[PDB]
Enzyme design. Sequence first.
Site, short mmCIF file in Angstrom:
data_model
loop_
_atom_site.label_atom_id
_atom_site.label_comp_id
_atom_site.label_asym_id
_atom_site.label_seq_id
_atom_site.Cartn_x
_atom_site.Cartn_y
_atom_site.Cartn_z
N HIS A 164 -2.49 0.79 -6.22
CA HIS A 164 -2.65 1.54 -5.06
C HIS A 164 -1.61 2.51 -4.98
O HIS A 164 -1.97 3.37 -3.86
CB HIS A 164 -3.00 0.70 -3.65
CG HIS A 164 -1.71 0.09 -3.11
ND1 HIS A 164 -1.20 -1.12 -3.40
CD2 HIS A 164 -0.91 0.71 -2.15
CE1 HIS A 164 0.01 -1.17 -2.62
NE2 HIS A 164 0.01 -0.21 -1.91
N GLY A 209 5.73 1.84 2.24
CA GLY A 209 6.66 2.20 1.24
C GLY A 209 7.21 1.43 0.45
O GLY A 209 7.98 1.76 -0.30
N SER A 249 5.31 -0.73 -1.45
CA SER A 249 4.19 -0.92 -2.13
C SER A 249 4.51 -0.56 -3.54
O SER A 249 5.22 0.35 -3.66
CB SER A 249 3.04 0.34 -1.57
OG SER A 249 2.44 0.06 -0.37
N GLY A 250 4.15 -1.44 -4.37
CA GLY A 250 4.25 -1.52 -5.65
C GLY A 250 5.78 -2.04 -6.30
O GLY A 250 5.86 -2.28 -7.68
N1 LIG Z 1 2.68 -6.88 5.42
C1 LIG Z 1 3.14 -6.61 4.15
N2 LIG Z 1 3.57 -7.23 3.28
C2 LIG Z 1 2.41 -5.07 3.86
C3 LIG Z 1 1.48 -4.44 4.36
C4 LIG Z 1 1.04 -3.23 4.02
C5 LIG Z 1 1.55 -2.60 2.85
BR1 LIG Z 1 1.14 -0.91 2.36
C6 LIG Z 1 2.64 -3.19 2.21
C7 LIG Z 1 3.15 -4.53 2.51
#
Ligand SMILES: N=C(N)c1ccc(Br)cc1
Length: 223
Positions: free
Chosen positions: A40, A175, A177-178
């Site tokens: 993503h 943020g 993410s990944g």
């Molecule tokens: N709650 C989480 N762990 C999370 C949710 C959305 C995103 Br984008 C990254 C992490």
Amino acid sequence: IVGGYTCGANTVPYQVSLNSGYHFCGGSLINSQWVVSAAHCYKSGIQVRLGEDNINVVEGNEQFISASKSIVHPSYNSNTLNNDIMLIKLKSAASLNSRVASISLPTSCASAGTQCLISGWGNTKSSGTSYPDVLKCLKAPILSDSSCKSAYPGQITSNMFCAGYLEGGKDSCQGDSGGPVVCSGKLQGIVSWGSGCAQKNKPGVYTKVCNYVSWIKQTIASN
Ligand SMILES: N=C(N)c1ccc(Br)cc1
Ligand SMILES: [Ca+2]
């Protein structure tokens, strides 16, 4: 990272920032030429930033290397987030040192209850937004499959696991993410999804890296 702690500069030497004019995702350096991130996080124009602590200041240990290629998993489904993994190849090899170092891939899948280290530059608030500029860290246990499916009924595949705290207050977030989930010194998860951040009964969901080691190894061997 909501409810975490400041890691300390370069104490997570495999953590990368992906920058397309701005930081938009984390990733993990798995050898001098390759980064693992979330599917993503795919976009064009990626520069990989290694050796970062404060992402807004050049502090002297960074390496900035453009991506030459991104490879999103062939079975990634952006609706369900199944197979949320991507490989990024660096245009040139990173110079490995104490502040820029690779993380090993797993040989087995980590167990429920294992304490892991999650890190990133994502939002630190469970309501509203605040983005830190220095790397944040969070210790979080892998949750049981039963609890994970109870939190997200109908949404957890065999390529996902939950980690964090059902009571909320501590989680990864946008943020992050990944970025990496490291357990027993190996890359077991990728920050993937979750309903909000740090909400009660809505823990973080992570790509199950141990299911992708064969694909990673074979892809790296041919690209
Ligand atoms: N709650 C989480 N762990 C999370 C949710 C959305 C995103 Br984008 C990254 C992490
Ligand atoms: Ca910096």
